[PDB]
Amino acid sequence: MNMLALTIILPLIGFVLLAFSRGRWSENVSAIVGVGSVGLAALVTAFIGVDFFANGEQTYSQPLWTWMSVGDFNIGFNLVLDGLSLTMLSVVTGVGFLIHMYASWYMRGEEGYSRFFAYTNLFIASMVVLVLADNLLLMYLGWEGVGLCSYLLIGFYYTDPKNGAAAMKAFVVTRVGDVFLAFALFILYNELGTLNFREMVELAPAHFADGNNMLMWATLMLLGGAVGKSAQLPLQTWLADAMAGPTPVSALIHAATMVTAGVYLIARTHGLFLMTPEVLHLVGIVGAVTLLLAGFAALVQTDIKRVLAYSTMSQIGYMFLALGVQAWDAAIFHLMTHAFFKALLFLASGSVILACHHEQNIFKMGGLRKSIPLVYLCFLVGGAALSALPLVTAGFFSKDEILAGAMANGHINLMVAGLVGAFMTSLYTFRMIFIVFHGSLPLIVLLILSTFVGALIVPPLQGVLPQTTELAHGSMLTLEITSGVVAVVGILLAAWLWLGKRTLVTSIANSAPGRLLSTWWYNAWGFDWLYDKVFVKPFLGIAWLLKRDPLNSMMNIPAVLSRFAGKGLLLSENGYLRWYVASMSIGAVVVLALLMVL
């Protein structure tokens, strides 16, 4: 358990070796290096978990060195490990190992193979840094590394320019969110004087006794950073566009790494949000609005990858709703289960794309349940876990815990929004299932983890996060029955429209209000249009207006004045002698007059 830094070192060494290989190595040796680095990180994580459960479940600290020290400003390179950090590290390493070996199968015969594995190794290393950070500055380093690896992996096929545009847009919105996170860091250091999480928790109530406004600003800025990284309101406009890249990078982004960072940030800084309950309720409201918006956006989508984008955004909104109703254990349990079934669904979607000659439109392919049965079975169990199918999956237990925590704390509206979101996600997921499919080791492991076997695993969150308030057993059973009935009714209703030949779908879809709503929800409720017309177009306009460097011409004005004055004065040197004598007389008159007036 003293090898905590090995989970950072080994992916870094793999990234360095695969980057300096420059593709001269064969596919076998480079794949061995990359997936072996991630597998050794996962095995070291398993050993760390074993000695963590064999030492009494105590928070461990490994201070490597001191990052910076300017007087009072002391920031250290210290790693920490608690139940939340162990859960995050375990899910990141395991899901990354499965995705890495599936990518070793998947990326064969492709250029940039070693570059792909180096970038994903750096992604894994940066997220291990993020989840094993004692203070907010090392957490910001992991945040920035995760964002840079997201940018470098989304635009992997650099030849096609829309991959590059998607990567640039994703990096821009994540940098805006990280600037909000930097605002949170500046406020927290200015008030409390430290960036360590534990010491911030200790000195927050002592300093914010008579005034609790800058703490609200700091928690609001933390929420802004979280919604920037997790693709929530109002910075969700990069997800579906940024699935322009390959499949395993998408599975890594949506399952374990990119979208769960904000959830981990809110869960880790739970005390500061607990002493500012209005910001926590704002987190819950943002999650509810984003999950409903994501469900309505995934209704009218025609691409399987964008459907999975808005499904990921909907479950991230579910996690933010759980964090806003003070249900932290439910949020982390949903994080792990969503990582499992979304990794399974993304890998099976990549298998679908490879089997159907790189076709992504769901309406083109049909009757795929009999062409290949195994991928259909994995897609079925992944959709059932995503639709919260009762008594056999893990997403049902995760969402049941989330809505139980929402109901037990008096948030009736958020629980209603969660029920509507569950109906919505069952409806669109089985819509996509029936449109696509009607008309091996990682897949098996993720299929096993997608069922109730993954629900048997509980995170060791006792002692780090506060316990969710217990609901009454009769109301708990009522909530479970209502959620199961809602999911089953949604699945049967989606089978009623989309399994047979479509009557009601085309009757209301071809209507003018129906076409208006479909075009509105297809473009993510007009947020890309708003950000293009409010933030991007004035930027291009100001750049085009300023490209002539107006300040340079403003400062070159006196050079033009000097040239004009010199050319004007040179006209007096005409070369005439009588003019010279007349000018001498004029100057004599001028100096005599100036001497007389004074």
Add this chain to the structure above:
Amino acid sequence: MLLPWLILIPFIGGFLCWQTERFGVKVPRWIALITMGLTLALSLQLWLQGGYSLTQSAGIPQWQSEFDMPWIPRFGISIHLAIDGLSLLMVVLTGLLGVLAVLCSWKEIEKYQGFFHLNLMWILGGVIGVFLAIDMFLFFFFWEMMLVPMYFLIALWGHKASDGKTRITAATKFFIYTQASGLVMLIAILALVFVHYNATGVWTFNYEELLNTPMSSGVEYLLMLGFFIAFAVKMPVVPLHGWLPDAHSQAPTAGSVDLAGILLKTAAYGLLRFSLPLFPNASAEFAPIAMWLGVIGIFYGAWMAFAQTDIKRLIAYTSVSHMGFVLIAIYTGSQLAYQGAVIQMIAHGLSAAGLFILCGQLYERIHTRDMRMMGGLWSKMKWLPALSLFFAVATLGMPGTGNFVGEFMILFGSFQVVPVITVISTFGLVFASVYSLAMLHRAYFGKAKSQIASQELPGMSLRELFMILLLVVLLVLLGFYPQPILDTSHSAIGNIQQWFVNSV
């Protein structure tokens, strides 16, 4: 006592490069490498001998090593050198970038390389003398005598693809800007000396004697204004910035003049050493104007750098934006902001050095610098696109590189002092990321937009790869372990900050 030699051995080395040119064309480059290796060795010896890590703050002045010699005793003018942590750090950076500049022009078998090397080390000795000298007349003399070889190198040895008229115009614009700012700085220095004489009665041009000078408010403001005009042209600070992209674009195509000449910013060192301690009250009153000029400089440089079709011009505007950040850092009166400013200047020097070297080698490979004529170059070369990706990542403020450390300690100190300028500067960092991504995508990613980018290009040799990897390793070590650099400059920065905030 090693400081006079530290200034002199670049000049003797340049004279030897000129003299031993008759021994052969390939001789003066070796002489220049030997004498810059010796200069860097003496700078590192002063680093290891000064004991900068365990040095307290005894108040201004506090010099680790000083040298005195009378130069013009009529005015009380002395060759007066003094080294402390900040001056030592900039001298070490000067030696490193001079070694890189000599190594970067290694492939020139031209007829008159001896005078090229002589002007190069004249520039290097001038900027070293600017860092070391504290006497006002000697500091001004170095400040304006490093200017002539810059002009001659830009005008004669500059970009071969451009006409002679454009190079002459760029060099003359740079010279007029910098020497007029030197002249108004000389007016401020002379008026300060005459005020000190009227107060006391002794001809002193010394920096330590001029600190204890009683000035009324309004006169000290004008002296500070002249000093800031000089250090605003040389930073550059908008609108006094038009010389910089013109001098960078018409610099020699090897790229040595950019690294040796302009990539060490003497203006921020002059603000820390001279503008802040000599005029504390005037700088405290001028802090809103200077900080808002820094804000305008950051956003203006970002808006230029997004809109340039020339990569060298783009990197010049990156320099404008980063030094706008440093200008915001100088006028806060904070320990953390000053230390972040020092880290940011060092990291910006290293990152812009890597960017300029890689841009020069890219121009050598493809014989053009227009960003509309290149694209999809990742599959065309071996090492250059990845290293330029690393340096473009470094220049946007990425952790693991020293730019993030410097910028974030700048912003932490600034937010401790002023919050609104801090938040606007962080949005300027967002703009910096925007222009870095734009340069990366318009340079190396996409499809080939011409025929010269559609063919396989030769790779970089071992020497340039070694120097670029050295810059990469230094940037990584600065980002992950900046503590020796922070401890080296902890005493002088503390003395400057205590003098600035204890007199108001």
